[PDB]
Amino acid sequence: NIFENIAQQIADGLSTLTIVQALGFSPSGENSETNSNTREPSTTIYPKKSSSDAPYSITEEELRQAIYIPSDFTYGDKPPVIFVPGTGSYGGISFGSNLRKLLTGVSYADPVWLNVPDALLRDAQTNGEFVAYAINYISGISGDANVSVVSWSQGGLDTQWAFTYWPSTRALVSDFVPVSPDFHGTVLANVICLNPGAGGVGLGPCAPAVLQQEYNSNFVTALRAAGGADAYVPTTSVFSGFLDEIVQPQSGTGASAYINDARGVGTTNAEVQVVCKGKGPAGGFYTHESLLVNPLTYALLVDALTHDGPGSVDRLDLDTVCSTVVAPGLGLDALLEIEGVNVLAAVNLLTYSDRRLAEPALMSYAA
Ligand SMILES: *[C@@H]1O[C@H](CO)[C@@H](O[C@@H]2O[C@H](CO)[C@@H](O)[C@H](O)[C@H]2NC(C)=O)[C@H](O)[C@H]1NC(C)=O
Ligand SMILES: [Ca+2]
């Protein structure tokens, strides 16, 4: 029986590989990207909720289908929480072994998650459309409750892009909790794609979302010049300065994950090695992916969800939070699962058929 659950886990993990999907399989289980969601929202959200919003380029059918609503969802009784995966991954598997498992069956959260086609590798401007639609749609079918957003890696960058160009979504998000975000992209993408940045032809073929996540990319530059480098809602950014093998730089105020707060809406910038320094293993070495099981990450998420404003380092009992390797309620097996999540993602990055020399054109709205 325990065998059947491992077989089904592996099958669900492999269905997220685009090479396997090319054989005609679809993402399965919690990574299903063809969900049937038949409730309508209280208000027109398509093609625009606000006449200030950027247009959608993707059909509402596809936008809505990437949202995975568990049967246990309470449509507003609890506060909804939308989970957003990172590059090469799906919302189901990015968080099922970590944060979303911990947020299943509690009173202050009600999880749903995004399964974007092609493992979040496609143009990030369209990944951003998925987050914008999800915020408006989930709220609009949940009694117009506020939602929260938790993201991993490019997910946070996608959320800032939805906030920047879909203003209507700012009004409905109590908390944005990005884990290992790259709000300034990453120079490791410039290196791997042998690419000058600024959308220039580079010698390394790379997925569109990878090219747009270069440190100086047109996507990142446009987003930051439009306001994407400052928080729009209370933002609890959690990142590791030792060592993020995907996102660099990633330490101090210069970290790609650092969100400024010029609008004064409230921000926490938590480098775990800083916050937990001298106080336990949770201040030790954490990867881009292993951060998702760090107790500081979980503690700051719950704090943010149970209090006005962002998660508060100073309100936490750092002596207790920092004292363990993994969040309470996970085992060291979560450390293993999250390593496999990263491997699957890596495979996707290396083997995705849509490799390009140049970064997607900015849509007319971003320019
Ligand atoms: C839902 O979240 C939004 C954004 O965090 C909240 O809207 C902000 O509310 C504060 C004070 O209530 C205002 O000063 C800001 O200008 C608002 N921001 C935006 C962009 O609207 C809103 O209060 C939350 N709603 C609920 C019911 O929690
Ligand atoms: Ca809060």
Author numbering: 83 to 449
Paper's wording?
Here, we report the discovery and identification of a novel lipase from Lasiodiplodia theobromae fungus (LTL1), which hydrolyses C8–C10 ME efficiently. These enzymes catalyse the hydrolysis of ester bonds of tri-, di-, and monoglycerides into fatty acids and alcohol. Structural analysis by protein X-ray crystallography revealed LTL1’s well-conserved lipase core domain, together with a partially resolved N-terminal subdomain and an inserted loop, which may suggest its hydrolytic preference for monoesters.
To gain further insights into its selectivity for monoesters over triesters, we solved the 3D structure of LTL1 by protein X-ray crystallography. The crystal structure of LTL1 consists of two nearly identical polypeptide chains covering amino acid residues 83-449 (chain A) and 84-449 (chain B) of L. theobromae lipase B (UniprotKB: A0A5N5DNA6), respectively. These residues fold into lipase core domains (yellow and cyan) with N-terminal extensions (orange and pink) and inserted loops (magenta and blue) and are in close contact with each other through an extensive interfacial area of 1229 Å2 according to PISA analysis. The model predicts that LTL1 has an N-terminal subdomain residing above the active site, which seems to be plausible given its accurate reconstruction of the core domain and correct prediction of the secondary structure (i.e., the two alpha helices, coloured orange in the X-ray structure and dark green in the model) of the N-terminal extension observed in the crystal structure. When compared with CALB, both LTL1 and AFLB have an extra N-terminal subdomain, albeit with a different size and conformation, and an inserted loop flanked by two cysteines that form a disulphide bond. The loop in AFLB flips inwards, covering the active site, whereas the loop in LTL1 bends outwards, leaving LTL1 in an “open state” that has similarly been observed in CALB.
